[PDB]
Structures are given as C-alpha cells and as structure tokens.
Amino acid sequence: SDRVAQLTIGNSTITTQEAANIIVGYGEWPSYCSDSDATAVDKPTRPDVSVNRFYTLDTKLWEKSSKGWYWKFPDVLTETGVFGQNAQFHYLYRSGFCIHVQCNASKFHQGALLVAVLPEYVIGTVAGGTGTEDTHPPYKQTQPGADGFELQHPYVLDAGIPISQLTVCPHQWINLRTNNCATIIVPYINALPFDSALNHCNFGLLVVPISPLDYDQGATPVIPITITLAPMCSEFAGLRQAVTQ
C-alpha cells in the first residue's frame, strides 16, 4: 500500500509492485502560472494530454564498474513527440515533471542507486588537469539529449561539489533488496515565470550507483536502468517558426 502504485497521465499508465512511496520535490505540486506572476501578454497554449504523458527515453546498463549518469530537463524531450514540437515552435515554456526511474534485479542481486534532481546543474571541466586552463564543457556535455551523459568524476559531480550532500535535493534510492523504481514529482523551478526550453535546462536528473551492483556468476548479468518521465501542466507562449537551437 506504499509498495504498490499506478501512475496514469495522458494515454499512459505505469505500474510498480515494489515502490517506496513518491517524493514531491520541495513539497509542492506543479501548477500553471498565475496572472500575477506572469509577464508575457499573449494567451498561452496548454496542449494537455498530448504533451503531459509518459515518455520512455532511454535505457542504460548497470555494470559493476558504472560511474553514474545525468540527463538535463527539458533537454531530454525537446525532440520527442508533440511536447518537442511545442518546445520548438514556442519561445516560452514551463512545466513540472513526474520522473519514474526503473530498475529491477532479483532477490539475489544487490546494489543501491541514488536518484536525485539537482536544479540548475552547471557542469564544470577539470581545467586542463593542472587547473591552469579555463576550459569549458562542450554543448554535447551540457545538453546531452535523450542519451544522457556519463559522469567522469561522480564524487564531485563533475562540478566541484560533494555527491555526499546530494540528498539535500529531492531524491529516492533504488536499493535492490527493497524497491525497483524511484518516483519524483518536480514543480517548475526557475527565477522567471517562463523560459526557453532550448537555452535553459531547469534541472538535471542524476542516477548514480553508491553501493555497487553485485551478484554471483550465473545470475542474469544484464541489469537495465530505464528512464520514463512525464511533463505536467505544460504551457507554451511566444509562437513563431520551429527552432531546434
């Protein structure tokens, strides 16, 4: 009754029989922008069911040596479905998200993933190693799209900050002996009421193994991690031609 769950939005339904409750980021559900917080004067478009629905975007393989990955929002979805089209045809965008990370193994496998959402996840570089070069991360690294990107130095989250404190952010753990998914609801987080879905990623999703995957030889060795997410309360404004960058 805390372990079983069904999430239905749009024409999509997710089920899980080994859940660990649901986290509502910063204790606040997503909502549409009020007439007093808004500034842009055109009437927005709110497509509803055709964009607020679950999209399964990618699968990674968890290996005994995996470092961890990250995805950026709304970047992961800007080229997918009717949501993508709207994000491309409109200058302004805003929405919340329901994130459902999936990973099942067996009662004989073990390991624990930390699944967290970090708003304004700015990536740093190793500065030429010596720390004397002011190098910058390239586009494919700051906005990896649906493929996500692998962390080079998980301990400092590729940004000079301790992953040990990442739990100060909305998160759940997928500890194999306990659950097989993480569900996080994130409201729209920004210092502006609407923004560009292309130029700005409001938050990053981090999936990092903290207790490494293990099992005895002979047990299924391919343990996937699949990412499914749904935009909530999407609004778009400032219509013109479609743009991808």
Binding site: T56, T59, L61, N104, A105, K107, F108, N180, V222, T226
Partner: protein, 97 residues
C-alpha cells in the same frame, strides 16, 4: 476472457498447445521487441481463438473497447518490466520501443 493465441505460428498437431502461450527470457540489452499482433477482434489471426472473436463472426459491425490481460507464469524468483503498447490507426508497426 478466453485465451488469445498471440503465438499463432506452430501448425503441426503435436505442437498446437504451444499456440496458447508466448515467451520471455533474459535479453542481453535494450528495448527488444517481444511480440506483436493486430487488435482487430474480427480479423483472421490471434483473436480467432477467443470466444469474442468467434461471436464477433456472427455480426457485421461492432463497437467498443477491448482488453487483454497478460498473466506471467515464470518462477516466483523471476522479475521484469514490459511495455505493452496500443498503436491507433495510421501508425505503422513501431520499429523500436
């Protein structure tokens, strides 16, 4: 509910019972296709094995929603997650998940 023969391929008399169930097994990777079938209840194919399909044959037209319930019969120790999708008219057979 009656049994839908998704696995309507074997035809030799000694393998006919195999039509009543289809398999899943450890895949080595990602988003693999497991099975596909048309949702048309009164069309030749998997649905002909169902009583619905058969009763459907005595009527020219039909209207309504359908439902397919899938029962997993592996061991208690086996786990997994599958994505079952229904593609409305006009969409061709999905090439990937």
């Amino acid at each position: 509910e009656t049994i839908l023969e998704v696995n309507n391929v074997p035809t030799n008399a000694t393998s006919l019972m195999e039509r009543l169930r289809f398999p899943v097994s450890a895949q080595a990777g990602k988003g693999e296709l497991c099975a596909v079938f048309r949702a048309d209840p009164g069309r030749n194919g998997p649905w002909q094995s169902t009583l619905l399909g058969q009763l459907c044959g005595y009527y020219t037209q039909w209207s309504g929603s359908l439902e397919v319930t899938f029962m997993f019969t592996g061991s208690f120790m086996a786990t997994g997650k599958m994505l079952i999708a229904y593609t409305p008219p006009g969409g061709p057979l999905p090439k990937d998940r």
